[PDB]
Amino acid sequence: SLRTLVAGVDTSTQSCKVRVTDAETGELVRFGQAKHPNGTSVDPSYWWSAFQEAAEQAGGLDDVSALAVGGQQHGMVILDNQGNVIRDAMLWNDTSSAPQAAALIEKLGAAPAQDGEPEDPIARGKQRWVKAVGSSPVASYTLTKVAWVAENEPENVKKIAAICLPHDWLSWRIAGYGPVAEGEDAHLEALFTDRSDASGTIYYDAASNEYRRDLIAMVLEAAEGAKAAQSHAEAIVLPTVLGPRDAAPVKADPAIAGKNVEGGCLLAPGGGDNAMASLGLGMAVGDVSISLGTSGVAAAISENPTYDLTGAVSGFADCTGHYLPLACTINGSRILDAGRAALGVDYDELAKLAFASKPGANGITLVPYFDGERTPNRPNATATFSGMTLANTTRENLARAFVEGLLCSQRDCLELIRSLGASITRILLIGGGAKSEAIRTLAPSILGMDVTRPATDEYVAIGAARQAAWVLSGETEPPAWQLTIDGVETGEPTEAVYEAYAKARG
Residues 364-393 vs Mg ion: string with x where CB under 5 A? Answer: ------------------------------
273 catalytic? Reply is yes
Q: What are the Cα distances from residue 236, in Å, to 84, 177, 206, 215?
A: 14, 18, 19, 13
Q: Which residue stretch of 75-83, 190-198, 447-455, 472-480 sits at the interface with Mg ion (rule: CB under 5 A)?
A: 190-198
Binding of residue 189 to Mg ion (CB under 5 A): yes
Residue 205 CB neighbour total at 10 angstroms: 21
Q: What are the Cα distances from residue 466, in Å, to 10, 70, 101?
A: 12, 11, 34
Nearer to Mg ion, 186 or 336 (CB): 186
HEC-encoded secondary structure of 48-90: HHHHHHHHHHCCCCCCEEEEEEEECCCCEEEECCCCCECCCEE
Contact 415, 505 (CB under 8 A): no
Q: Reduce the DSSP state of residue 197 to 3 states and report it.
A: helix
Q: Is 106 annotated as a binding residue?
A: no
Phi then psi for 271, rounded to 5 degrees?
175, 175
Residue 273 CB neighbour total at 10 angstroms: 25
Exactly one of 94, 168, 197, 273 is catalytic; name it. 273
Tell me whether strands 64-71 and 271-272 are parallel, antiparallel or unpaired: parallel
Please spell the DSSP secondary structure of 277-291, one letter per residue: HHHHTT--TTEEEEE
Phi then psi for 41, rounded to 5 degrees?
-140, 150
Q: Is 191 annotated as a binding residue?
A: yes
Least distance (Å) from Mg ion to the CB of residue 456? 36
Give the residues across from 28 on adjacent strands: 21
Nearer to Mg ion, 228 or 237 (CB): 237
Q: Which residue stretch of 185-193, 346-354, 467-475, 487-495 sits at the interface with Mg ion (rule: CB under 5 A)?
A: 185-193
Please provide the size of the chain in residues.
506
Binding of residue 415 to Mg ion (CB under 5 A): no
272: which residues sit within 8 A by CB, 6+ positions away?
70, 71, 72, 73, 165, 167, 196, 197, 199, 200, 316
Least distance (Å) from Mg ion to the CB of residue 145? 21
Least distance (Å) from Mg ion to the CB of residue 190? 6
Nearer to Mg ion, 249 or 493 (CB): 249
Residues 197-236 vs Mg ion: string with x where CB under 5 A? Answer: ----------------------------------------
Nearer to Mg ion, 187 or 440 (CB): 187
Least distance (Å) from Mg ion to the CB of residue 87? 23
Q: Which residue stretch of 25-33, 72-80, 184-192, 348-356 sits at the interface with Mg ion (rule: CB under 5 A)?
A: 184-192
Binding of residue 187 to Mg ion (CB under 5 A): no
Where residue 39 falls (left for φ over 0; alpha for ψ -120 to 50; beta otherwise) is: left
Eight-class DSSP state of 361: G
Which segments of 324-380 does DSSP mark as H helices, in order? 334-343, 347-356
Residues 229-258 vs Mg ion: string with x where CB under 5 A? Answer: -----------x------------------
Number of chain positions touching Mg ion (CB under 5 A): 3
Q: Is 36 annotated as a binding residue?
A: no
Least distance (Å) from Mg ion to the CB of residue 191? 5
Q: Is 320 annotated as a binding residue?
A: no
Least distance (Å) from Mg ion to the CB of residue 70? 19
Residues forming the site for Mg ion (CB under 5 A): 189, 191, 240
Binding residues for substrate: 73-74
Q: Which residues are catalytic?
A: 273
Binding residues: 73-74, 189, 191, 240
Binding residues for Mg(2+): 189, 191, 240
